[PDB]
Design a protein around this ligand. Structure first.
Ligand SMILES: Nc1ncnc2c1ncn2[C@@H]1O[C@H](COP(=O)(O)OP(=O)(O)OP(=O)(O)O)[C@@H](O)[C@H]1O
Ligand SMILES: [Cl-]
Ligand SMILES: [Cl-]
Ligand SMILES: [Cl-]
Ligand SMILES: [Mg+2]
Ligand SMILES: [Mg+2]
Ligand code: NA
Ligand code: NA
Length: 214
């Protein structure tokens, strides 16, 4: 039985790293909705130009548009094991997917809000030089100050707590119904933790029972 899987996780949860590792260790196709959108935007396809119109304005792709795009990619990939990442993002997407394919495995990375928030708000910049500081991994010698110049660091808008809080609230509003949908269907597997490297072995062992290695 070929894998018919979805992976879910908030921004900053480590889902990107886990999906990357899944793809390197297992013989499957990684189907990232963001990659698919970007391929179409790069090539200027009909759906790519429409997607660009939304993304350039910071808008979600409408459900019907996104589902049409995703199903078209899947339609010629049924000879392969699949790992859907980024789709379904919303309950209408998940219900539309359910009318097209039987999804047998949904992985969720359950990482605490405070942990995610700290990860997503950690980046500070010295604008003139472009030097990057990460409160967790390469902090400045003096809080809030550039090491070479003594000048203030700033946060880019995407990295500020106000923006991050809104982003995580949106993710929760959109995806909590999807998680509950798959929980009810009995296909949800939840991995909880605070460090990607401590979660990955358990995801790895779980998938070892479901799809061949690469
Ligand atoms: N399944 C989807 N439904 C609706 N919009 C989507 C979907 N997947 C991607 N997008 C749009 O494409 C953008 C780029 O996708 P990508 O997965 O790279 O997002 P991202 O930069 O991680 O942002 P996000 O936090 O919104 O996922 C998203 O921000 C979103 O607007
Ligand atoms: Cl992530
Ligand atoms: Cl494959
Ligand atoms: Cl960083
Ligand atoms: Mg994303
Ligand atoms: Mg340093
Ligand atoms: Na990809
Ligand atoms: Na990617």
């Amino acid at each position: 039985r070929l894998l018919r899987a979805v992976i879910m996780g908030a921004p900053g949860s480590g889902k990107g790293t886990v999906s990357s590792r899944i793809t390197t260790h297992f013989e499957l196709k990684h189907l990232s909705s963001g990659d698919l959108l970007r391929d179409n935007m790069l090539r200027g396809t009909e759906i790519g130009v429409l997607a660009k119109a939304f993304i350039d304005q910071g808008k979600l792709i409408p459900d019907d548009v996104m589902t049409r795009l995703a199903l078209h990619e899947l339609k010629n990939l049924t000879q392969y094991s699949w790992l859907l990442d980024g789709f379904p993002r919303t309950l209408p997407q998940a219900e539309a997917l359910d009318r097209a394919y039987q999804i047998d495995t949904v992985i969720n990375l359950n990482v605490p809000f405070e942990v995610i928030k700290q990860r997503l708000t950690a980046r500070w910049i010295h604008p003139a030089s472009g030097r990057v500081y990460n409160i967790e991994f390469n902090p400045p010698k003096t809080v809030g100050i550039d090491d070479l110049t003594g000048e203030p660091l700033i946060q880019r808008e995407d990295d500020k707590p106000e923006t991050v809080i809104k982003r995580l609230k949106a993710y929760e509003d959109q995806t909590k119904p999807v998680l509950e949908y798959y929980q009810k269907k009995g296909v949800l597997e939840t991995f909880s933790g605070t460090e990607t490297n401590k979660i990955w072995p358990y995801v790895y062992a779980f998938l070892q029972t479901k799809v061949p290695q690469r």
